[PDB]
Design a protein around this ligand. Structure first.
Ligand SMILES: [Mg+2]
Ligand SMILES: [Mg+2]
Ligand SMILES: [Mg+2]
Ligand SMILES: [Mg+2]
Ligand SMILES: [Mg+2]
Ligand SMILES: [Mg+2]
Ligand SMILES: [Mg+2]
Ligand SMILES: [Mg+2]
Ligand SMILES: [Mg+2]
Ligand SMILES: [Mg+2]
Ligand SMILES: [Mg+2]
Ligand SMILES: [Mg+2]
Ligand SMILES: [Mg+2]
Ligand SMILES: [Mg+2]
Ligand SMILES: [Mg+2]
Ligand SMILES: [Mg+2]
Ligand SMILES: [Mg+2]
Ligand SMILES: [Mg+2]
Ligand SMILES: [Zn+2]
Lengths: 38, 46, 123, 173, 136
RNA sequence: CGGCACGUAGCGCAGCGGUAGCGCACCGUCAUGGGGUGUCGGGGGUCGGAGGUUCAAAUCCUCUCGUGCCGACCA
RNA sequence: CCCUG
RNA sequence: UCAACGGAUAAAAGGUACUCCGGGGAUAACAGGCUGAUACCGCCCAAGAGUUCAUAUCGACGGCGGUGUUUGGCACCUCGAUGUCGGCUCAUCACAUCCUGGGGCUGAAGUAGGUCCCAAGGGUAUGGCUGUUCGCCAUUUAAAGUGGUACGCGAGCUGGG
RNA sequence: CCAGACAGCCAGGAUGUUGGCUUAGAAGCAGCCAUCAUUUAAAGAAAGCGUAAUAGCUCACUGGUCGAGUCGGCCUGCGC
């Protein structure tokens, strides 16, 4: 998980998701893309 | 093949000129057979 | 009770005579070392052909204390001086080849079987 | 100057052995003199890059306001302090010029140390520097390294060393 | 780093930045980056943005820089009391109002121009937008 | 940081609206067996850089980047 | 004044 | 060139830590206050380094903020007095966490790490030098945190500066 | 877009050819240049992973199943 203030899709399998009022993107392709709006 | 001991010690600019100013590359004196440095007190075989 | 800046005699033939405890290993703000505890010493006198010279910093283990050891029965074992056996910094075995004077029993551990064997009598 | 000049002339590093009937001597006694040819390429004098804020450690302390500035270059480990001025910015600027000066000094010392190491190696080879021998008394020219000989001393001293430099360059000495 | 080669005067008043800009039309090229907010642009900001545009597009098309930093900005050096003369010239800005076509470009496909303008806008300190040449 | 002093030939120095000067040095010839000293005869300078006035700028002005000096004090 | 070992 | 140019006399420079009086927080020095250029700490874009790969770790060119936290700006409080450095004694708060505790990613084999997120419960060296804060050095320890508190604390101590 | 759309689901994703160079190896995938043709449902001298390079795993693309909406740009109010 990488905590950034500008979270976005980086590769094509990355998915935006909103959990508990927090925007994350999750990646079934590479765990490096797992990142969090904070 | 043995190392030469240069008399300049620790050379930090130019070792070729250092060996020139070492006695190894000195100018050498030749004993004349006749002429100026001509006289021999004793012969090679006498 | 051995603390910093404490002068100790040398209990083996390592070559030193008088040492100074300068640090008590094994704890933060640890004050005293009893018998059988490692300390860091510096050497103030030495035999001229000794195996270690003056001014070296190396470990040592306390083998005699004027305060002495308390036994579980209620006894105490008081000596008349404070002495130590010098050890190497990294390997922790005695530098010398024999130990002078009596030592006490609780040094009987897997680190100091050679101390217990080389001692003349074990109290 | 010109293309491939150092490559053409790089085999000339060394000593030349003149043997000739000297005219400066009164008796006409022959002399065995020596000279050295030393060739080195025109290396580019690269600009000295400035130092990084992360590479520096900046501290402020009370002068003996904490206007005193201690700048520490961390990757090499060199510090400079400055406390004479009331302005911390002036102290920091003087400390930064001290940083640049010591960095230039250390780079020069590193270059001189590498040059001294190369000189240690080529002083170790030593006698191998005697590369060329002109016997004008017997009129023969000799490269000892390639071992080659010729008799045309006037052509050699005119500058027809093409055969010798090609022999040396194919030798790789 | 843009700068006028010589000027009539070395220092200039602070001034105001009221009104809306003219030059609101794409003039030479086709695709333009036009300001929406209001503020100053340092010549360093102009240079960084222009570098980002030209090295994003990799030298196709042609780039027009429709602004120039003509206004000198003074800054008084630190630990100096107020007054005792106007401060020395430090850098040059261009006063930019809303609706100023900042950058302009041609000869490039639309998506590439949009991407290059995105990098430029990331380097800019003010709101910008993408505009297209209209025939009138 | 603030003043104020100077950027002149390879070097050391004068000249501070129209003219570039002196010494050492370099070159060439003499003198010497030869070198030095000596004698004869020459040359050499965007006048630190840039731009402004003036008919004209080394000289007048501004800025510039070097080196030197004097102060960066009461708390 | 000097005269490469 | 009474140019200090509405011209004090025709005619006049300094030191005071040996000082003294009248006054001023109208006006400085410490501390507080406002601000935050600078400083510190974050974040945005991503050229490039990273064998390939911007984003494991760095991050140019530039940009946007936070704190009040250094150096500064002002001169609003105090000049019918608000005792300033350092040490000692005793502290308390914050979290931008030094250790211990939970976790994500890794260019994470394990060990040992690197970076980030959560977390302030407890803990967090002794000495040589110097008045020192600081820093360097020696040896430890799980660690030797960073800051706020009139740069905490002199109607609590010292008085080396 | 009921000349069946979007997302799933079943299939292909080839031939010259490994396009050449320079490399050390260069095969879509290190860099450079060109970026065609055939079969045409469609296959890019290849978008990505991967190989020491090949290999291998996908994608763009298009065929089959299903049967009502699909998709992302602009302006704008309030929010995170
Ligand atoms: Mg004083
Ligand atoms: Mg002489
Ligand atoms: Mg008046
Ligand atoms: Mg008074
Ligand atoms: Mg006031
Ligand atoms: Mg104050
Ligand atoms: Mg107050
Ligand atoms: Mg302040
Ligand atoms: Mg006022
Ligand atoms: Mg009162
Ligand atoms: Mg936290
Ligand atoms: Mg609890
Ligand atoms: Mg205080
Ligand atoms: Mg404190
Ligand atoms: Mg005090
Ligand atoms: Mg008090
Ligand atoms: Mg005193
Ligand atoms: Mg908000
Ligand atoms: Zn991803």
């Amino acid at each position: 998980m990488k905590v950034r203030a500008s979270v976005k899709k980086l590769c094509r399998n990355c998915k935006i998701v909103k959990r508990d009022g927090v925007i994350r993107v999750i990646c079934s392709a590479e765990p490096k893309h797992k990142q969090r709006q904070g | 093949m043995s190392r030469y001991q240069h008399t300049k010690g620790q050379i930090k600019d130019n070792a070729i000129e250092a060996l020139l100013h070492d006695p190894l590359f000195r100018q050498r004196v030749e004993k004349n057979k006749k002429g100026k440095g001509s006289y021999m007190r004793k012969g090679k075989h006498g | 009770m051995i603390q910093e800046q404490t002068m100790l005699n040398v209990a083996d033939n390592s070559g030193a005579r008088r040492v100074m405890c300068i640090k008590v290993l094994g704890g933060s703000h640890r004050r005293y070392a009893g018998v059988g505890d490692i300390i860091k010493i510096t050497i103030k006198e030495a035999i001229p052909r000794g195996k270690v010279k003056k001014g070296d910093v190396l470990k040592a283990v306390v083998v005699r204390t004027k305060k002495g050891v308390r036994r579980p029965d209620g006894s105490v074992i008081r000596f008349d001086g404070n002495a130590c056996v010098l050890l190497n910094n990294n390997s922790e075995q005695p530098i010398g080849t024999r130990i002078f004077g009596p030592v006490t029993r609780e040094l009987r551990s897997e680190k100091f079987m050679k101390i217990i064997s080389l001692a003349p009598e074990v109290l | 100057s010109g293309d491939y000049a150092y490559g053409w002339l790089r085999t000339e590093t060394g000593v030349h052995r003149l043997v000739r009937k000297s005219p400066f001597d009164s008796g006409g006694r022959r002399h065995t003199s020596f000279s050295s040819a030393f060739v080195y390429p025109e290396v580019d004098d690269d600009i000295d890059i400035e130092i990084n804020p992360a590479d520096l450690r900046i501290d402020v302390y009370r002068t003996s306001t904490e206007s005193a500035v201690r700048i520490t270059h961390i990757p090499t480990g060199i510090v400079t302090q400055c406390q004479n001025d009331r302005s911390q910015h002036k102290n920091k600027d003087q400390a930064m010029k001290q940083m640049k000066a010591k960095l230039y000094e250390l780079e020069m010392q590193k270059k001189n140390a590498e040059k001294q190491a190369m000189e240690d190696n080529k002083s170790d080879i030593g006698w191998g520097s005697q590369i060329r021998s002109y016997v004008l008394d017997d009129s023969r020219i000799k490269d000892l390294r390639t071992g080659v000989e010729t008799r045309n001393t006037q052509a050699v001293l005119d500058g027809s060393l093409d055969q010798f430099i090609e022999a040396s360059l194919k030798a790789g000495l | 780093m843009l700068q006028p080669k010589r000027t009539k005067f070395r220092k200039m008043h602070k001034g105001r930045n009221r009104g809306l800009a003219q030059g609101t039309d794409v003039s030479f090229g086709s695709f333009g980056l036009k300001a929406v907010g209001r503020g100053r642009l340092t010549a360093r900001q102009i240079e960084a943005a222009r570098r980002a545009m030209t090295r994003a597009v990799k030298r196709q098309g042609k780039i027009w820089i429709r602004v120039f930093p003509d206004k000198p900005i003074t800054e008084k050096p630190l630990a100096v009391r107020m007054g005792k003369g106007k401060g020395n010239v430090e850098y040059w800005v261009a006063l930019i109002q809303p609706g100023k076509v900042l950058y302009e470009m041609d000869g490039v496909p639309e998506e590439l121009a949009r991407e290059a303008f995105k990098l430029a806008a990331a380097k800019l300190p003010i709101k910008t937008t993408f505009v297209t040449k209209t025939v009138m």
